[model samples]
Target: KIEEGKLVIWINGDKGYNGLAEVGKKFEKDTGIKVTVEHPDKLEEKFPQVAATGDGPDIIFWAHDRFGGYAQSGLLAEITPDKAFQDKLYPFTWDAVRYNGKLIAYPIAVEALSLIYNKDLLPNPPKTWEEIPALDKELKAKGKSALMFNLQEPYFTWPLIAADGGYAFKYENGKYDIKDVGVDNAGAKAGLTFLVDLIKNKHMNADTDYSIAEAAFNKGETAMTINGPWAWSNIDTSKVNYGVTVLPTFKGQPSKPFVGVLSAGINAASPNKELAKEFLENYLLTDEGLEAVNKDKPLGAVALKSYEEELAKDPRIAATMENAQKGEIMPNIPQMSAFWYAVRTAVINAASGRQTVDEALKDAQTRITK
Candidate 1:
């Protein structure tokens, strides 16, 4: 058993050793606290099991969306902000971690999705969804595709729906409600129609593998694609002149991509809550801590002041940061996971010409409700 003041941590292993091993070591050295890092490849199974057995660690690093299930089941400890921690966090950073009336996590990093294009292929990115088809036609005449999207994955479509004035769920009267789910809204239907038309018109390859889309871009087979900041390290900037821009809007509103915040949450069951809080306050909030993670991980920091200062000196970082401001935080509610899968399936089915927009959305709504 851990002593009253010792800290232990658990992290997902699939994030790669660079995230868990490297960041864990940094945390230990900065705090002088013994932190045992556990990386079970099957965190989905391990997390709930540990929590149920009352053997959970002192700190856990995972996605914000998981917070909802834990909190609802009374498995997570509440970490509400006082004047101290609240004043230090970036505005959006706090927004991402807050669910219902409680704050349950401390954000460490932030990510947003946007359009990354090869400037040589398309000098300018499309400004709206309506423009995508014409651009595809223009690209086809030159023996190229206007853009590529992950038709098999819902991850990319969530933001597109939002950009088209559709929301998966809404917050009202102090609680989350999916009653008015807008997956079938007129604007959302337009967005879905656009994607289907792109594939039908031969502007996108229907058989393309989602995993290879980025590689296709790198190989000059694709002109543009929608993706996240995590893919930045994999891109070769030297061989290609690339441009990053906010996702195109449907009307006049900016496309609101889903924002993901990487955060640190203290385990309520930990015997060392006070010590863990101290470690988080000192190491995770400091300038050195922020810089160290940003240097190696490079997803961008969640510290507003630090990010702004860094962006002022780097044009590339500035552009990425600008794109982040246009996104909405991905919902951390427990029902959101199911909603995501259903919506993505609906979109893919619709894009594949398997169903009409209305028919696909009705199926999505039914699946989510069940």
Candidate 2:
């Protein structure tokens, strides 16, 4: 029998935890279920261990990337959205939550980077990387750099590299071959050189971290940065007069960001499996429920076509839709962990001049494979 009175959730951050809490309370009120939401540390490390004992929370909320590992390990319950509910979502959102032909999570929102610029500083954002040199020169007159972001962060910098054909894993025919890591290719080396040269030529600072780059944009010290919708809260608070658009192309090719989806996944071993499905399908995926989850801290692009009217009201959301479509679905394989660690080291090493672009990427290739 389905668990009658208790429904528990484990979410990652304060904003998401609080948002789900609001919806959970509403669900409890309607159905007489006791809902408990916990914000735990080291959730990534904690989840698998707890889940293995069949004592994990019914639902785990995180990005879709982690679902691959969970599904592969048989820790996640396969789920199917009702046809009616599925109709409300984007096709890619459905594609995002499936692993090994099983639907493993409920897709919530989509995210990808765009070119965010201080409108006051750069009246028109550059369309291509070729324009960066001229724009850098112009912005220097105003005591600002043309563009800067967390240079070592592959998430922030990958679009430029991917525009030139770099990729973390070889994806084909709707499957990722993790053995085919692609970061050391000729095009990848070319892109790495461009990224490193941006720092060496003084267009961007090698020392910039996310905090520093964000603050610089907020204070008008930098004219542009690549970011997604999540940065809006700080930008909104700063009153920086910002605008977002599709990220600049590299040479003549379009930059490819990684499209990520945040999702709610069910534990395979939960006693409340049926109840969890009911909770997700009947309550959490509804208009009132999704709205409540997003009310406090906005989500990326809402996957619900029902939000078309709401999306139209926000220009920032409108601007990022194209970039989201242009992006590749981030590989959800467990090996992506290796990609993250290796890229961080490779980018930092190349940008710091400790390794040439080829050396850095070649080393990263070995790290991922090894």
Candidate 3:
């Protein structure tokens, strides 16, 4: 009766591992395959070497951006879940995990940057960039900051950049063309200028890190912030009266934040490939499986429409869904690994007056390209 073999899975955090362990309890009953979920520190940094030695777990959880790197390294197996099982996903979710026309993994949940704001500070979220400066002026008079985040983190600034026509690479036809880098386009300079103006004028600066920003918002020292749902874990919503929404637009275009989908991918060299496939395709794709994984974090824009529909009543989920609805999937291409540090340094330089606005933008483009 117990024909399927044992398989291991690597998850990232305690919350993530706990969720899967609960799902694993049910998984063992129906499939007869023993499941062990372990939380590995720095799995992204350590996985390739471990996997290269053929000791990697059967499945690993991570964002889709790493998919391109893993696939390119021949470390991922092509996933071919049946069409019916696949139909539940947002096509864009599928689009996120696919590279070179092959499915690299099963989509998990959509995580994008949204305006996680203080409800007490802004009754309604701003609808345009023009609204922020005026609000910042009013807030500063009372010894509070209006908007703050890890200003040097390029991911936080990317939507504003893309809103003004910047991109890490060109997405056309079916895939990304890394050769067509646009990090320094004219529109990008416009975006950078707007960002530097905020720093030079005292609206925001590069002094904050993720923890600093989250802590400020939690303590009611800041009015609003540009952050993701993960930032919610540190916040006590009751104390702060938190509300989430899409970011204000640039010109008329919504800020298109990068949608980072946390997903499960099978190791290409796993000995139990078929069993891993059966586990993911047959058991893990259902609401039951998703419940075990996403129960603690129901606000993510889940890949399964069932989970998504079930979560429709939560306001936080609604806000996150809205963010993702207007966003593009973050590319998983290996070249993307080169993007952040370069652009982040540029943001800091421009914000600190080390470089001019247009010059920093040009340097970012040049750094990303050969």
Per-model TM-score, in order, reads 0.87, 0.89, 0.91
Off by over 4 Å in 2: 1-5, 16-19, 25-34, 82-84
Provide the overall lDDT of each model, using Cα atoms, as 2-decimal numbers: 0.70, 0.82, 0.80
**lDDT (Cα, tens digit) per residue for candidate 1, span 1-370:** 4456566776665444354445457766866666566766777557677776677777787777677777676666777558766777667667666667677778776677778888898887788777888787777787787777676776776666667667777755435675656677776777677667777877776666567788778777778888876676666653777877767877777777766777778766777777777766766566665665555455453554655566436545555556667776677777787887888779778877788888898788777766
The residue ranges of model 1 lying beyond 4 angstroms of the native Cα positions read 13-33, 36-38, 172-174, 301-304, 311-320
Most lDDT-accurate candidate: 2
Error of 3 at 218 (Å): 2.5
Candidate that scores best on TM-score: 3
- Return the lDDT, model 3, position 72: 90
lDDT (tens digit, per residue) of candidate 2 on 1-370? 2243587888887456687888888878888888889979978779888888777788898889888888898999888667887888777777778776778999887888889998887888889987897889887887778987878588887888888778888766557777887899877787888888878788888888898989888988889988877788799999989888888888677888998888889888777877788888878777777788778777757777777447647777876767877777888888888899999888889888888889998988999988
| Residues forming the 10-long window of minimal summed lDDT in candidate 2 | 1-10
What are the per-model C-alpha RMSD values against the true structure? 3.1, 2.7, 2.8
Tens digits of lDDT, candidate 3, 74-181 = 888998788877788877788888888788899888888888788787788788776788889998888888887877588888888778677787877668898898
In Å, residue 9's CA in model 2 sits off its true spot by 2.1
Regions of candidate 3 where Cα sits further than 4 Å from its true position: 1-4, 140-143, 296-299
Residue pairs clashing, model 2? none
